[PDB]
Every structure is written in C-alpha cells, then in structure tokens.
Design a protein around this ligand. Structure first.
Ligand SMILES: CCCCCCCCCCCCCC(=O)O
Lengths: 283, 68, 41, 263, 265
C-alpha cells in the first residue's frame, strides 16, 4: 500500500551566526520568497502527515453546480402553447459559482457530468387533477435543426442524444466526453471570431470579440411530452454540471467584482470589491 | 476484471500511515466502455509549485543573495 | 521602524513598500465551502 | 571568473541586448519556445520557419512614466504586426505560432524611486467601455499596434467612445484585482536595484497553432506599483522602452496578404 | 559565493539581518557555553531556558547628535525587565549568560562619523563627589535599558549628596580614569558610517566565578563613543539614531527563591 505524499515536515534547527541569509532575497526576480520557519526561528522536529487532498483540482472542481433554470409550461390555453417546450444555450456562464471556479484557469480540459432536476407546481389559482408528467431533454448539436414547436418533427431524435425522464423517478444523469475542437477549452479568448478587412471599417458591429463569439456547444431543447391538461403545470428544470477528470493550465486570479453578461464586462455600480479599514494600524 | 485501491483514512482508522490492514481497501469495476462514464480519477498529489513560484532561468539558492 | 529611514539630500522623503503574502510548503486545507465573495440576483 | 546574475547578453538574430542591472531572467512556466513537434500538429502544409529573419528584437515606441501614469497596455502579436519580417509573415500566413522574449527597459538615477510591475497575461481579455452591449470593442481599438494603450483609474462607460477597453488599473481592465496580478509570470523593475526586466515566453494556447490576425494569445501589462518620485521636481519623467523578439517563429498556410481594417 | 558584509543572526524567536557589517567579533576567541560539570560551584539543579530568555531584545533607542559625548549600559541591567530573561534573573539568586550584542546606526553616503562600540568587563565607574569614594546609589548605578550618558565636564560636588550618587561619566577617561584611546584593548568594533551600519560582538561570560548573582553584579558593560563626529553638511544639526539590540545566550540559573524586587524609582 502506497501512502500519499504529505506536505512539508519541519526539521529541528538551532541558532545561526553565518553569512548565509535565507531571510533576504529579491522578488524582482519574479520569484516568491522561499523562506520557511526553520530559516528564521528555532524549530522543533515535527512530522507532517497532512495531505493536500481537498486542494487537488479534481476535488476543487468535483461538485455539481446548478448552472441554469429553465421554464416549461404545460397548458390548455392556446396562448401558452409556445411555452410547452424551451431551448437553452449550453454554457456555464449563467451561474457565478461555477464560472468563478473555472475562471481560475485560462484553459481546461475535462469531461462533464450532467444531472437534471425537475420541480413542478400549479401557477394557477385553480388546481386540479393532472396525470403524471414526462419530460424530454434533447440535445441539438451546432448546425442541427431545432424544433419550432413542442410537436415538431425534430423531437423524433433520430440523430440527436435524448433522455427521457418520468417525473418522480431519480433525477436523470449522463456523462459527456470532452468535446472541444481545440485540445483544451479556452475560458478566455482575446480575439475576434473573424478578421474585419480593409474596405469595411466600422467600430460598431464588432460583436465578434471574446470567446462568446467562438463557442457553440449546441442547445438543450426541453419538452413536456404530455398532452395539455385543463390545469396548467409549471415546471422548473434545473441543470447541473460537474467537471471531472480535469486538467487546467495557466492560472489567473479570480474575479473581484460582479459579472455583467457573458464576457469580462464590469458593472459601473459594482467596481468596488473591498471594504474600508479605519486605519493602516487598525489590526 | 475489478481493480482494488486504498480508501481515504476514516474516522476510527487511527493509522495515518495509511497502510494498515486489508480493510482500508475498495473495489472498482467499470461498467461502461466510454471512459467519460468512469468515476473520478485517483487522487494524485504530484505537484511542481516551482513552476509558478520561482520560474527563474538561472539557479537561485535560498542562502545566496538573490542579487550577486 | 527600527532606528529610522535615512534620506540624503535631494532624495525623496516619502517612500513606499509593497507587502506580499503567501503560503509556505507546510500548508494545506481541509474542507470546501462556497465562496462568500461574489453573488448574482 | 567574475560572472554575475546582475548582467546579461541576449542575442537573437542580428540583435543584441546588454544589461548591467537586472534580477536574473524569467522563463514563464519553466518552458522555452520550441517548434511544433511531429506528434502534435494540425496543419498539413510544410511549415515556414523564417528563423533568423523574424527572430530578432524590435523596439516599440517608448512611453513616458509620469507621476500620474496608471499603467500601459500592449497586446503581444499585435504590437509586432507592423515590425519587419515578423509583421509581414503574420499577414501572409493564415496560421502562425511564436514564443517571445520580452525586455522592458527603464533607467533612473539613484535619487529616483518607484517601481514597475511587468506582467504577461495569457488571453488578456478586457472589459468594454460601454454598458449598452457586452463584449463590444472595435477591432481597431482592441489592436493598437506598437503604440499600445493606457490604463486609467476611472470608469466612464458610454450610453464611438464605447468601442474601446475599460482599462481600469486596479482591476486590470477585467474585474480582477491587481494585487493578484503576480499569479501571471512577472518581473519587477524596482528603480532601487534594476533598470530592466526580461521574460521568456512560450507559445500558449489551447491549440498548437492559430490565426494571428484574430487572436492575441499574450498581452503585456506594465503598472506602477510604486509612484515615480524625485526630490528635485513635481514632474520627473522616465521613458520606458519595450523591446520584443519572436522566438522559434513558425507559419502555416500561404494566402494573399491579409489586410485588416485600418484606421 | 557570500559576502562578508551580509549576515543573518538567528536566536530563539528572533532574527537580525544586516547588509553592512564588518564581520563579527567573538571576544577572546570564545563562545558562550554552559558550565561543565567539572567547574560547577552550586549543587542545585540548574534551569536552562532554551528559547525563552535567549532571544534578542531591543533597548530604548538613543539619538546621536553632534553634541553627544557617548552612551553606556550595564549589560545584565539593561535586560532586567526583558521578558523571561528579566523574570529569571529576579527569581533566581544566581545566573550566568553570554550575550550577542548588536549595535545599529544608519546614515546616508553623504554622512560621516564613527562609533566605537566597546565591551568592557567589570565596567566600574567613578563617583561624582570628592568627599566620598566608591560612592553611587543602586538606582543610579543600574539605570536599566535607558542606559546613561557620557559628558566631557567633570563637575563633582563635595557638598551635594544627590549629585554625588551619580557617576562621573567623563568620555575621554571612560568614566574611570583611563584614556579612551586605549579602550581598543577591549573587544570592540567600529560603526564607521562610510563602511558599516552595524556591529556584532559575541560575548562569553567572563568572571572569577563560574556563576554569580545577577542582581548584584554586572558582568559586562557597553560603551559607545563618537570617535568621529557626525556631520551631514545639508543641515545645521544632523541626527541619526543608535539602537542596541541584545540577546542572552547559553543562559543558566540556580538558587530559586522569591522574586527579587530591587529598590527603584
Ligand atoms: C441528451 C442531452 C445531451 C447533452 C449534451 C450537451 C453537450 C455539452 C458539451 C460540453 C459543454 C462545455 C462548456 C464549457 O466548458 O465551456
């Protein structure tokens, strides 16, 4: 049995009167200071059995997060037929907690576990007998046709992945292999999707900046598959994601301020991330 | 064709040695052929902090002055 | 201040220093929690 | 025999840089630029390797360090787009790849004080100066050339003034506190000990090779960390000169010269 | 390689660095050690603190002005309230220690002047009255971390009992009748402002006994003199601080009793 490597142990050490100076360095070098307690104080011999387990990237990332909430309305009213199904752009952008962890890195490569959770209620003041509902989650790859309606032919899912869930059973779940075209997903893209060429010179219209212009993972088309009932059912579909088997590159700091949309845009009302301290000598 | 590995030390498992008994083991069988379907990878504590904390071209020693 | 900062003639009398913080090699964490530093409506 | 970490001679192509006062040198992430290996390659076309033609240092227009400066911004493959052969090849070839040597120069007397942090940021994506639409910056403003751009300490988004970056210094232009800028490979020119900084930059992307007219894989950020000061005057000035060379330059796919929107 | 000027001294929970020292002196070539069984006087079970008393302490700073004639300290006395060293010397009848003495004084390259730092064993000083001999109060004899000062005027009083109980601390005669120019016989280092900004002297315990009573006797004193005057030429009156930092080392005590509380003001 192989014991996992522990963090640094401390050797015992005594006093020093030498020309060696572990405490003085330069950081101008790009290096962080390297001093440890045995370099500046006398120390005792302490065996360190602790490990960096929860800090591993797999552990850090390995939690499902809610990413989005979709709204489906199963209704007999003709004016609500269009709401019987809904379509969502696949992204992690919609929720702050997950994009924040992912944005610690410039690039990442991972497989993704998705779980869906369904909750339903009656939005009406008059509830009544409704038969158990069934839901369909269809994946539509980029370039694939999308349904114009809940009963459109595309729901046949002859080429598309599709999972069916009967309400009340365990939340449906599946695993998605890494699908990036690149050899890693980029969480940032300092560039444009297309190069505007001489002859078409405008400032406005350059909506091609940022990764948002080069990422299309298709959509999730979610449908109640039931016939309309006299009493309307409002269903909340929560989409969860858990990155797994993840490798990350080129770390960067986390965002200090609130996000505005899909890019790195700041909100003028919220660019002040720190609290005031009464004085430099406060403690 | 199962694989056997070692569990994270539990509450009553008083050996921080992590190599005591055959009762600290677990068995994993893969049930899918697509590797994306497998459970999380084994913990790997290999690290190389120097990559980010001291990426200096020339050798730096703690005791030597940083600038000579 | 130990002693004092000594400045020669025609030299600035207001200096700055930059403090930095980092973890040492004998360092780890035990359990995850959601960060308290960011939110959304 | 008297060799010292304080001095260095960097020679690439027909260009040599000598330094008397520097804090070693940095190789970002511990890696040097290399050519694309046979085991990791996308393009089919035989590569073009300009070698000694493009792999020389070019000097970007200098900027002045004033006591009110908040910082300076450059994008790396962009700042060299009009410089010599490197420039011409990125316009002729669809794909390209290169590493870089970034050398920042800033001399001052022993009676001056102040410090500049030099950071190299992979994918230096910046926020826009408008609240009408997100991720909305013109091609021209996002690609200033050797001129670069500057950081500010105020945010005044528009509701043409909008299609440019909201380059706040304290948030590094993207909502990220500057104190953490040190995560990125960096070096400090502390006028107390150094007059220059050197960083070796590997090609970094999610791809082996990419289109240079579209993607700036690295950016250069220079920020005062400590203000410039000199007892004799309220407005001392010190020029900062940024000198850059491509390394291991490689290109793939020859077409008609690309001519991007210009001014 | 390593320079001679750059150094790091670590003891207990404290470190002192320097980038401008003229090496370091080990008085008489000997380090502080613990008493060998073969030389022990008491038969008590000794107390040997490891990292309590053996840390550096910073004494109240003094100012160097062009008119100062020097400063002095009695060594065990200057650390009498210094944490655990202080408490142990009062709880125990006997005690012994060596010391690391580190003196600091900054100046710019435009400044000039020099400080002689001398360690004098048995630094006995003259009374300030001509009517009595070997006359000095306990309190004036033992000022604490504050130290005392040297003067260049001998103004004894054969009628004023109060002044007579203070020391006649002449600078040129080191307070005892010896020309200062011969002070160099004692272990010493010079903080010449154009060369160094600090000095370090390692001090063994030196006495006729292996161990003595600390509340009664000062094994060593510290004398700092303005061997060369301070000057800046960009002011009518330059000033730089001098700070003395001291750590006991290889400390031991015996004779545990009620805490001694000396007469004080
Ligand atoms: C039947 C439902 C199948 C759903 C398949 C969805 C495919 C999603 C691809 C992975 C998204 C990656 C997002 C990112 O990291 O930027």
């Amino acid at each position: 049995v192989s014991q996992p490597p522990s963090t640094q142990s401390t050797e015992a050490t005594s006093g020093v009167n030498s020309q060696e100076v572990p405490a003085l360095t330069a950081v101008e070098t790009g290096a962080s200071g390297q001093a440890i307690p045995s370099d500046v104080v006398e120390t005792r011999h302490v065996v360190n059995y602790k490990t960096r387990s929860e800090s591993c990237l797999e552990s850090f990332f390995g939690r499902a997060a809610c990413v989005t909430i979709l709204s489906l309305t199963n209704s007999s009213k003709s004016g609500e037929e269009k709401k019987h199904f809904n379509i969502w752009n696949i992204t992690y952008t919609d929720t702050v907690q997950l994009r924040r962890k992912l944005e610690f890195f410039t690039y990442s490569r991972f497989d993704l576990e998705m779980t869906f959770v369904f909750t339903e209620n009656y939005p009406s003041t008059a509830s009544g007998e409704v038969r158990n509902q069934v839901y369909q989650i269809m994946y539509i790859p980029p370039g694939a046709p999308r349904p114009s309606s809940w009963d459109d032919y595309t729901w046949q899912s002859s080429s598309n992945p599709s999972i069916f869930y009967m309400y009340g059973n365990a939340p449906p779940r599946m695993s998605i292999p890494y699908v990036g075209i690149a050899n890693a997903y980029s969480h940032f893209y300092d560039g444009f999707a297309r190069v505007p060429l001489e002859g078409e010179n405008t400032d406005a219209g350059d909506t091609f900046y940022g990764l948002v212009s080069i990422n299309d993972f298709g959509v999730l088309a979610v449908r109640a598959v039931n016939r309309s009932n006299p009493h309307t059912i409002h269903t909340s579909v929560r989409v969860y994601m858990k990155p797994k088997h993840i490798r990350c590159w080129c770390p960067r700091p986390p965002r200090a301020v609130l996000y505005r949309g899909e890019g790195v845009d700041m909100i003028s009302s919220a660019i002040l991330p720190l609290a005031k301290v009464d004085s430099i000598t406060t403690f | 064709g199962a694989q056997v590995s070692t569990q994270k030390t539990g509450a009553h498992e008083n050996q921080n040695v992590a190599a005591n008994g055959s009762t600290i083991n677990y068995t994993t069988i893969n049930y899918y052929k697509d590797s994306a379907s497998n459970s999380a990878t084994r913990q790997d504590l290999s690290q190389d902090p120097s990559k980010f904390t001291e990426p200096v071209k020339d050798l730096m020693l703690k005791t030597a002055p940083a600038l000579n | 201040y130990q002693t004092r900062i000594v400045v020669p003639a025609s030299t600035p009398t207001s200096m700055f220093m930059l403090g930095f913080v980092s973890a040492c090699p004998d360092f780890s964490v035990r359990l995850l929690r959601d960060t308290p530093h960011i939110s959304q409506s | 025999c008297g060799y010292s970490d304080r001095v260095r001679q960097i020679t690439l192509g027909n260009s040599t840089i000598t330094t008397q006062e520097a804090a070693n040198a940095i190789v970002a992430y511990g890696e040097w630029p290399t050519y694309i290996n046979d085991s990791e390659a996308n393009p089919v076309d035989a590569p073009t390797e300009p070698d000694v033609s493009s792999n020389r240092f070019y000097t970007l227009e200098s900027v002045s360090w004033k006591t009110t400066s908040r910082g300076w911004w450059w994008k790396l493959p962009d700042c060299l787009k009009d410089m010599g052969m490197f420039g011409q090849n990125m316009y002729y070839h669809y794909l390209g790849r290169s590493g870089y040597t970034i050398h920042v120069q800033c001399n001052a007397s022993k009676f001056h004080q102040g410090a500049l942090g030099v950071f190299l940021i992979p994918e230096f994506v910046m926020a826009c100066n408008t609240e009408s639409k997100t991720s909305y910056v013109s091609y021209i403003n996002a690609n200033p050339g050797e001129r670069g751009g500057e950081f500010t300490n105020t945010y005044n988004p528009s509701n043409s003034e909008g299609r440019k970056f909201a380059a706040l210094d304290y948030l590094l232009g993207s909502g990220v506190l500057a104190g953490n800028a040190f995560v990125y490979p960096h070096q400090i020119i502390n006028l107390r000990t150094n007059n220059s900084a050197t960083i070796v930059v590997p090609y970094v992307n999610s791809l082996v090779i990419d289109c240079m007219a579209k993607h700036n894989n690295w950016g250069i950020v220079i920020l005062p960390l400590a203000p410039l000061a000199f007892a004799a005057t309220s407005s001392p000035q010190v020029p900062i000169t940024v000198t850059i060379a491509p390394m291991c330059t490689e290109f793939n796919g020859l077409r008609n010269i690309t001519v991007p929107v210009h001014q």
